[PDB]
């Protein structure tokens, strides 16, 4: 019951792309937050504006 | 406890229906790195669901038959073992992890980053040349790619074109070797120096 | 500071971005990568970028020339 009701949950926060994806990662370092920072990238790379731009170019170094 | 073989308990819970009792008989104990304790111990988390525990069940003692373990959990729909029978089979060995992918478990994130510890060069063109023509997020493709020392050479900067005139513009990377490759060049230049001068001092 | 300016206060950018340049370098890669993440277009000049190019290609002259220097008298004195 409550495990497979457990189960559904997950593809259930913002469906299995940023949400039980996200809980997995938190269950490279950030560096590799930084990496999945040039991360967001929608409407258009959703990034190099500011923070995104700004971290990759600092590590990239 | 002590005194006891466990090998010659398991085995009676195993064919009994009734194992799962020895659960937390299996919580103190698993130190012994026992094959029947990790082996139908992890049968337990993989159909109970259990994860944290799973993972951490397997966090140091290794004992066991790292292959079919994996097989069920592929052969599931809860990703949360499909990600970690991913693991399961990579397990310090990133090569399989990547070379089984495909259209799912094409995750635009950790596949990103389980690369990178690579070591088969090459495999960068694999999965490059795939990105081109599968997805677009070639860019943070061909560039975490590049930033790594440099195991994305000419002969991948290029197998791109012969396709994609348009597309190709990025670059964060490509100069991080230029001056790199200009900085390992004061220094040698630096060095040169070195030699020159001297070379004045016992001989002008 | 100043050519960060040029952008986004006037257009001579081109004289701006060169001149600072062609005096040893003080624009690095670190300059000529912010134009493309930002101005796409706008960029195009060089007089200096080559300057410092086979200047990085004469260094180099010199250098493989002494490398050889190197070589010869090893192999010389030790053959």
């Known amino acids: 019951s409550e495990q497979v009701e457990k189960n559904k949950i997950n593809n259930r926060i913002a469906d299995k792309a940023f949400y039980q994806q996200p809980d997995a990662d938190i269950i490279x370092x950030x560096x590799x937050x930084x990496x999945x920072x040039x991360x967001x990238x929608x409407x258009x790379x959703x990034x190099x504006x500011x923070x995104x731009x700004x971290x990759x170019x600092x590590x990239x170094x | ?18 194992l799962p009792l020895v659960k937390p008989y299996l919580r103190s104990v698993q130190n012994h790195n026992n094959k029947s304790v990790n082996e139908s111990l992890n049968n337990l988390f993989i159909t109970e669901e259990d994860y944290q525990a799973l993972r951490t069940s397997i966090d140091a003692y290794d004992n066991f038959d790292n292959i079919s373990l994996a097989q069920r959990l592929e052969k599931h729909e809860l990703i949360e073992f499909r990600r970690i029978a991913a693991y399961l089979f990579k397990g310090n060995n990133r090569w ?15 596949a990103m980053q389980y690369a990178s510890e690579s070591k088969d060069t090459e495999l960068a063109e694999e999965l490059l040349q795939w990105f081109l023509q599968e997805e677009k997020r070639e860019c943070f493709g061909a560039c975490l790619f590049t930033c790594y020392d440099l195991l994305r050479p000419d002969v991948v900067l290029e197998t791109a074109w012969r396709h994609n005139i348009m597309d190709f513009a990025m670059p964060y990377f490509i100069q991080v070797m230029k001056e790199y490759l200009t900085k390992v060049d004061k220094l040698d230049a630096s060095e040169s120096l070195r030699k020159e001068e ?3 001092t016992e001989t002008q």
């Open chain 2, 1 to 18: 406890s002590p005194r006891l073989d466990h090998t010659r308990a398991v085995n009676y819970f195993s064919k009994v229906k009734q």
């Open chain 2, 96 to 110: 399989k992890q990547s070379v089984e992918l495909c259209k799912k478990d094409s995750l635009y994130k950790d």
């Open chain 2, 198 to 200: 001297e070379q004045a």
